[PDB]
Amino acid sequence: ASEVPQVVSLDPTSIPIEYNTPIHDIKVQVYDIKGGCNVEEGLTIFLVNNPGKENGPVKISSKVNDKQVSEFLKDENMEKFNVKLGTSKHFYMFNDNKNSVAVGYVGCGSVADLSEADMKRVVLSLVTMLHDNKLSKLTVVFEINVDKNLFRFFLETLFYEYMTDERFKSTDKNVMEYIKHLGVYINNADTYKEEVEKARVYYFGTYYASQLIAAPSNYCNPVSLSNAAVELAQKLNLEYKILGVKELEELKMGAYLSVGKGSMYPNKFIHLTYKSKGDVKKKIALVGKGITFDSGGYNLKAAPGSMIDLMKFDMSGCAAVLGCAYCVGTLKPENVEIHFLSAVCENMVSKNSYRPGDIITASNGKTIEVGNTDAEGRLTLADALVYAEKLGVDYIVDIATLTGAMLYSLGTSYAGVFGNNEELINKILQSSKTSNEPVWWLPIINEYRATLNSKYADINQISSSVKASSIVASLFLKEFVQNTAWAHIDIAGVSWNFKARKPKGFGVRLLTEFVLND
Amino acid sequence: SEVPQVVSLDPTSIPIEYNTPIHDIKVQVYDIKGGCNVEEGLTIFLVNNPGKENGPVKISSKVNDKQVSEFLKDENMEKFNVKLGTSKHFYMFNDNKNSVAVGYVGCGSVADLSEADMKRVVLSLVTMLHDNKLSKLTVVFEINVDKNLFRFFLETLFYEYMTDERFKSTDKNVNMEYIKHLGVYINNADTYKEEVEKARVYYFGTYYASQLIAAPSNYCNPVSLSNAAVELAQKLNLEYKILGVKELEELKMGAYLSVGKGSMYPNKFIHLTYKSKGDVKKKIALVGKGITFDSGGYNLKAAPGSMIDLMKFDMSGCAAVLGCAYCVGTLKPENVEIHFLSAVCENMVSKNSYRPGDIITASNGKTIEVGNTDAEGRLTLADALVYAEKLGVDYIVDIATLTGAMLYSLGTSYAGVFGNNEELINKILQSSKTSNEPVWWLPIINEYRATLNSKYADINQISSSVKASSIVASLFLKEFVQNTAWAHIDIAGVSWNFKARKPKGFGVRLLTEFVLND
Amino acid sequence: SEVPQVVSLDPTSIPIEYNTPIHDIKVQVYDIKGGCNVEEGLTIFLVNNPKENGPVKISSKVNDKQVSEFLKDENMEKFNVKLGTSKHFYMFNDNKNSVAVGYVGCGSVADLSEADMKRVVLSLVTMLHDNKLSKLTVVFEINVDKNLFRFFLETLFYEYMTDERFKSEYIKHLGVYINNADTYKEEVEKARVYYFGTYYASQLIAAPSNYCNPVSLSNAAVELAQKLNLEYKILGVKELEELKMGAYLSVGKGSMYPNKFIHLTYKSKGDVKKKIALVGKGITFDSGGYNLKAAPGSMIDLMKFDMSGCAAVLGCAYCVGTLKPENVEIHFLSAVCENMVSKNSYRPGDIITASNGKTIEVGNTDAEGRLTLADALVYAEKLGVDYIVDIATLTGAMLYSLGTSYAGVFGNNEELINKILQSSKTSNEPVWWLPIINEYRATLNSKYADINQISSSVKASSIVASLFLKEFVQNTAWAHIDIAGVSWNFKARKPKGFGVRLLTEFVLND
Numbered sequence A: 001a002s003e004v005p006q007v008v009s010l011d012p013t014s015i016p017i018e019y020n021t022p023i024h025d026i027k028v029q030v031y032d033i034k035g036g037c038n039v040e041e042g043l044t045i046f047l048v049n050n051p052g053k054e055n056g057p058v059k060i061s062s063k064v065n066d067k068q069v070s071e072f073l074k075d076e077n078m079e080k081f082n083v084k085l086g087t088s089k090h091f092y093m094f095n096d097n098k099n100s101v102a103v104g105y106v107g108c109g110s111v112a113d114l115s116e117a118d119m120k121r122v123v124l125s126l127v128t129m130l131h132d133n134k135l136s137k138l139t140v141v142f143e144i145n146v147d148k149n150l151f152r153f154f155l156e157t158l159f160y161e162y163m164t165d166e167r168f169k170s171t172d173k174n175v176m177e178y179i180k181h182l183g184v185y186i187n188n189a190d191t192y193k194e195e196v197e198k199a200r201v202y203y204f205g206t207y208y209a210s211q212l213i214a215a216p217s218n219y220c221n222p223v224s225l226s227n228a229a230v231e232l233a234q235k236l237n238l239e240y241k242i243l244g245v246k247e248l249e250e251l252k253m254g255a256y257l258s259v260g261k262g263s264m265y266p267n268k269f270i271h272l273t274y275k276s277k278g279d280v281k282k283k284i285a286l287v288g289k290g291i292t293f294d295s296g297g298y299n300l301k302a303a304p305g306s307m308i309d310l311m312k313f314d315m316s317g318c319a320a321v322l323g324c325a326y327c328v329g330t331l332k333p334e335n336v337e338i339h340f341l342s343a344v345c346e347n348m349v350s351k352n353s354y355r356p357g358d359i360i361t362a363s364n365g366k367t368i369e370v371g372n373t374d375a376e377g378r379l380t381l382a383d384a385l386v387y388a389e390k391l392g393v394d395y396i397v398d399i400a401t402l403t404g405a406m407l408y409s410l411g412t413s414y415a416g417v418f419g420n421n422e423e424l425i426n427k428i429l430q431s432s433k434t435s436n437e438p439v440w441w442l443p444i445i446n447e448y449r450a451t452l453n454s455k456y457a458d459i460n461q462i463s464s465s466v467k468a469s470s471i472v473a474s475l476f477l478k479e480f481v482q483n484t485a486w487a488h489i490d491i492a493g494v495s496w497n498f499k500a501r502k503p504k505g506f507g508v509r510l511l512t513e514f515v516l517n518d
Numbered sequence B: 001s002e003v004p005q006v007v008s009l010d011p012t013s014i015p016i017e018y019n020t021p022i023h024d025i026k027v028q029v030y031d032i033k034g035g036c037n038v039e040e041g042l043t044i045f046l047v048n049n050p051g052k053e054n055g056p057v058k059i060s061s062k063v064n065d066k067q068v069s070e071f072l073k074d075e076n077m078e079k080f081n082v083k084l085g086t087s088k089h090f091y092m093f094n095d096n097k098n099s100v101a102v103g104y105v106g107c108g109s110v111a112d113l114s115e116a117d118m119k120r121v122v123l124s125l126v127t128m129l130h131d132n133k134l135s136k137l138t139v140v141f142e143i144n145v146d147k148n149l150f151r152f153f154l155e156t157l158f159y160e161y162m163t164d165e166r167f168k169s170t171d172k173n174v175n176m177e178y179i180k181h182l183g184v185y186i187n188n189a190d191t192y193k194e195e196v197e198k199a200r201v202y203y204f205g206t207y208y209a210s211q212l213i214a215a216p217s218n219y220c221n222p223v224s225l226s227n228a229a230v231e232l233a234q235k236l237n238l239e240y241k242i243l244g245v246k247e248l249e250e251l252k253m254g255a256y257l258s259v260g261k262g263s264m265y266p267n268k269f270i271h272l273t274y275k276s277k278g279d280v281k282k283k284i285a286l287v288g289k290g291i292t293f294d295s296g297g298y299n300l301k302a303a304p305g306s307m308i309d310l311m312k313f314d315m316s317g318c319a320a321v322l323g324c325a326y327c328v329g330t331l332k333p334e335n336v337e338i339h340f341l342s343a344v345c346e347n348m349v350s351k352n353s354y355r356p357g358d359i360i361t362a363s364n365g366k367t368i369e370v371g372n373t374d375a376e377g378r379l380t381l382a383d384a385l386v387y388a389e390k391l392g393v394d395y396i397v398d399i400a401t402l403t404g405a406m407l408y409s410l411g412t413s414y415a416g417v418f419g420n421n422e423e424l425i426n427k428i429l430q431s432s433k434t435s436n437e438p439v440w441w442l443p444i445i446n447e448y449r450a451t452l453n454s455k456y457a458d459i460n461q462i463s464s465s466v467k468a469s470s471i472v473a474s475l476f477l478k479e480f481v482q483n484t485a486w487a488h489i490d491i492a493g494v495s496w497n498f499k500a501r502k503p504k505g506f507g508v509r510l511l512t513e514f515v516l517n518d
Numbered sequence C: 001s002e003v004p005q006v007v008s009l010d011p012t013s014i015p016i017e018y019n020t021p022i023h024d025i026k027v028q029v030y031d032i033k034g035g036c037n038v039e040e041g042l043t044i045f046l047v048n049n050p051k052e053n054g055p056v057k058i059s060s061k062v063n064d065k066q067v068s069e070f071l072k073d074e075n076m077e078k079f080n081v082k083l084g085t086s087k088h089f090y091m092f093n094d095n096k097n098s099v100a101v102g103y104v105g106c107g108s109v110a111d112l113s114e115a116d117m118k119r120v121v122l123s124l125v126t127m128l129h130d131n132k133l134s135k136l137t138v139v140f141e142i143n144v145d146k147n148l149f150r151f152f153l154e155t156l157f158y159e160y161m162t163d164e165r166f167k168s169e170y171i172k173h174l175g176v177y178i179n180n181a182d183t184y185k186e187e188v189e190k191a192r193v194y195y196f197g198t199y200y201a202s203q204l205i206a207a208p209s210n211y212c213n214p215v216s217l218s219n220a221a222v223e224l225a226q227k228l229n230l231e232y233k234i235l236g237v238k239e240l241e242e243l244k245m246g247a248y249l250s251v252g253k254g255s256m257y258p259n260k261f262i263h264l265t266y267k268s269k270g271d272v273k274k275k276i277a278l279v280g281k282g283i284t285f286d287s288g289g290y291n292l293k294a295a296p297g298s299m300i301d302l303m304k305f306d307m308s309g310c311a312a313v314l315g316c317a318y319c320v321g322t323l324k325p326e327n328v329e330i331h332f333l334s335a336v337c338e339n340m341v342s343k344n345s346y347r348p349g350d351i352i353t354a355s356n357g358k359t360i361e362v363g364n365t366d367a368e369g370r371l372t373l374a375d376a377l378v379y380a381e382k383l384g385v386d387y388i389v390d391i392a393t394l395t396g397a398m399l400y401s402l403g404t405s406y407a408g409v410f411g412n413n414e415e416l417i418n419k420i421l422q423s424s425k426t427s428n429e430p431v432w433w434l435p436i437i438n439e440y441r442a443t444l445n446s447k448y449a450d451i452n453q454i455s456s457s458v459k460a461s462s463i464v465a466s467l468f469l470k471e472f473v474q475n476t477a478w479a480h481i482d483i484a485g486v487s488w489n490f491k492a493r494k495p496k497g498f499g500v501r502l503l504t505e506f507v508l509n510d
Ligand SMILES: CC(C)C[C@H](NC(=O)[C@@H](O)[C@H](N)Cc1ccccc1)C(=O)O
Pocket: A294, A306, A307, A314, A372, A374, A375, A376, A377, A401, A402, A403, A404, A405, A462, A469, A492, A493
């Protein structure tokens, strides 16, 4: 725990973090649809679709244990409504005990397997029914087919979208009550019950990352972010070490140190370790890019579209890695040891900053000619990757908001994965499938390597000719892993939900599924 | 108090000239019905010809000299016309056989001169004074002017004639000599006589603001500007207090303090007070934006057209308020108490600067999400407005070089006024009329308020979607006045005289007439 | 048809060379086992060292004592194998004849990539361009695939050939020494064919927009079909109107050249087991239209290359027509036009109707290729084929995603994408599969028309364009190959002729 330096006494000295959220107070009950649905207080929503028939009629198929509600939901009455994806309706009636009940449905369209994107749309509709309605309970009845992973994703997403982050509200808090109870009716319920607590853990790891990402750069700087990581390790009983500048100089981490030279906050390198109590069969290092604010440095983000105002989000890789630490430390997988690493710093303009053209020496002794101070993420990752390989692990996976070009290549929905090992890339792609966080495999094109040849240094930080900047970044990172299966996930395009004006906490579940299924 | 320096050659005060050559001019007013004595120096007739576009000159005054009367006969004048701003010089021997210079300035053919027309007249008169070593000027009014326009004539003559040589060293004008006497002949002289020393006061308030504005950012910084304000207050016997960082921290002025974080000069908040002896019937806070240099901060003024080289002028608001303090302190109105306020600081790039995205807390507890460090003026004004309202005043008027959009809406001639109270706005418009500093009322459009809703903080500093930036800045300021009549004068477009390459000292006479009228 | 002219000096046809010096090279391949004969011309060894940039050491026996001396280890040690490094020396052989002997460095890595083999070849071509030689012999002291061997041959031939049509010497023999020489012999004439289809494509692309316009390009395609005995049909503006190709006709509106739609057909002898339509973007000059290419980086000077897909599809027609694969039927389609600024041009905001009835709101007149392809895809689908593959210089964003080396392929059918990926492997023209992300589809929801041509929000423009194209195929396996990044060799200042060998491999394989 280090002291956060301040310029004025009003500067904050820690990131506010909510651990005990209202989602954690929700009691979840799962029931099998074969027993019929009981319809009482709160709101009961049926998820309904109509395979084949685009915008086909709503038909409720579950038995409802109430004659009045059954009459209301009969085919004749329901057929005037359709299943258009995201569409919803509210119903009011008196049940058999003469107590008014609210019921409704959300349309799930006409395609029998919902994509992760479609399910998100269903959930967003559901959340709009929760908002601006003081409810003690929500009950959801599944009349659509979902596998266990998709069921879990539904719950994670519901929890995540429902939770409102009011840490920075003062005079403008939403005068917002949360349900206390969530009932779920589904066929073969016993088989889905295990997903409930798993969803609740994955929600929090995601939401925890999101809290770190949304925290502004005055709150979340390298000192306060490494202090938060210390606190998280203490809560989960993970080992931890925070390396400070004296130890970083001793390790010759010149690339990482150069990036931080301009900051009033000392670099802090985060190292958390989870080890299973049994025989360790796999060792994994997860590396996250940890830039708490990216101004660009002397290559200032001044160009139209450079989005300097969003650059508190440049520690999203680090957040995903810490969200993963939360999930792993909670679920406690066996036979594995996991290292959670981030070379945390801030990229600023100062008499002290590194310069375009500076030649700096990484910890593996490679000299690097700086071509653009705004390509700082790959310099911090270079040193974090050398540290990670020294740990003697089987896999290194880094995750980073590394290149704006991702917005032009995969866009805002899919992350890109690059790597030096196909078995490991396939594992990441499998984790993507079971986490429902989409990733697409992109190539490291060796032909571009030659454009990183420096006239003076051992290597160039950037290409002068190749515009394929995400692949060029990957080529540069590859030079810092000598003999270990490595994969790199570029989340520059996917991390921030531009429409909703908030983080996604992208990568937490992906990396956790990777760890668990190994 | 002590001005920090980087090197010993950095200046530690603003040079300020109080006893200017204008102050040494002996001014006499005579009634025109006694006829004009033409004895020495230069004698200029102000002549028009109503109806006749570019009509002939006809000198109507009685002239007490046969030789000069002969010269000025209609036949001899008929070659010349009254085209606005046109002028001629004549040379002749008078009755005492002493050579004299005589001439005229054409005042056009519209019998009521606008402020801009009158400025054109004065500029032509001034070109006759330049490059001619004269000890005396006499001006004969053969046009119609009310008392306010006569005063405007003199104020404008004084200000345009005065040349600012404080930063000249090897290039002072070896030929500049100023007249020692000004004679004025006008109909109903006795009623105009009162205007002479009022003009001299108003000239000085305006010229003082001008000196402060023109003083570059290495001379005029938060420390030297607040020191100059103390010296002013001492000279006029005003109560004064300068609030330093520790007091500002105690007052929780987090928005103002965040702006000045990246500067080598500590924040200084100026608070001067004039109080009439006797019953105080109106209490007024005048608030001036006082950014001594606006680099833009991490949103650096680097786009083409951003005028970074002009940004020493971003304390023009504060200068108008201090110019006003000079006039009020000199003229001593009854029945009022006036607070002259400025939150002074410099907006710089540093490891210590606030960043885009930072969430800061204003002195009224509202949290603000910073969307652009270059919208700094509204942050400093926010805390200054909160401070003003705590004083328990009847009216709060702020004046500020706030938005570049003023150049596209009103341009360089008229300031914009916005406000929450129609009677206050009308007072300002009234003062605009009698000061001859033009102002136009612009709307605060509440439909745009929703664009300042922040996802995380209570409010956004800037709009995501609305390009009407002067209106959006007024919506933001309005959030920091709770229940007091308030108006905001945006002088961004009018403050600097781009053609003459000098300040106008805009707003000193406006604000003084506002105080005096009330 | 006759090409319109503004002045009598305007060209009325594209000059094409069919018979090239490459066609006069006699090629012979020999087994390395019996040693090499260095009797005449230039001999180059392809040598690696599996020591990084370590020394050259030559292992083949040579049947000349003087040359054998030159090639002794002690001498060869002074040179290194760094990929693409070369040296060659003139000397007198055993019968006092002048010969030149050298090596090209093949690096330290066993499997040579496509890109590495290109480097080897550029270095070889550097020597050929600089020397008056009647014969070249190449000795493979490195291991190559049959396919990579053919690739070596195609690249050699293509790079060596110089295009002099607009300006106002070659070897006559090629000897190749290689292990298991008998297995590589059938690669030789296949390469010569792939060379020419690629070179032809390159000639159309390199041809400036005053020479190559929708009229002269369609005339060239007719002449190709005639030389090859393919069926051909050029659709003119009247038939295009009859067919309601309003998206395509709109793009052509501002141009002095009438739109011409090319449709060539290859049919196999024997039972036709597969039908395929290959559709190429054929914009003969893309100015951007009222959305003019004026922005820094917009490369308006290169936009003669905007018919590269069309050229790939015609080069493929040459290969298919020549090689004559069986059990397959192939349609070669291109909706050719030119995108210009005029009083007659289509405008930003215009609503146009495609041949399948879909109305389209134009957001950008520079997204013209997808409009021409929309009509071409409808046309293609009406043919009842098994696969439709289009190839197009569609989005500048490709430079930012895959870059200049690898094309992107998007599709609606994994089986078909997999076949294209495999054709990529065997052609050695690299392609990477990119996703059609359906979450972006809603951004093409137009307020007024059935669909928007462009997204306002999504910057992933190559995916957006694919989502748009996808709306014009209803029920047929389809893939789209975006070659905007890949088509032009910026550094060498010439086309690559990219896609010809890919599509021919696709046709020959499946
Ligand atoms: C100089 C370039 C090769 C690299 C440069 N990279 C960066 O700026 C990273 O440090 C940025 N964090 C990338 C970024 C930009 C916009 C939105 C999301 C992510 C980029 O522009 O992407």
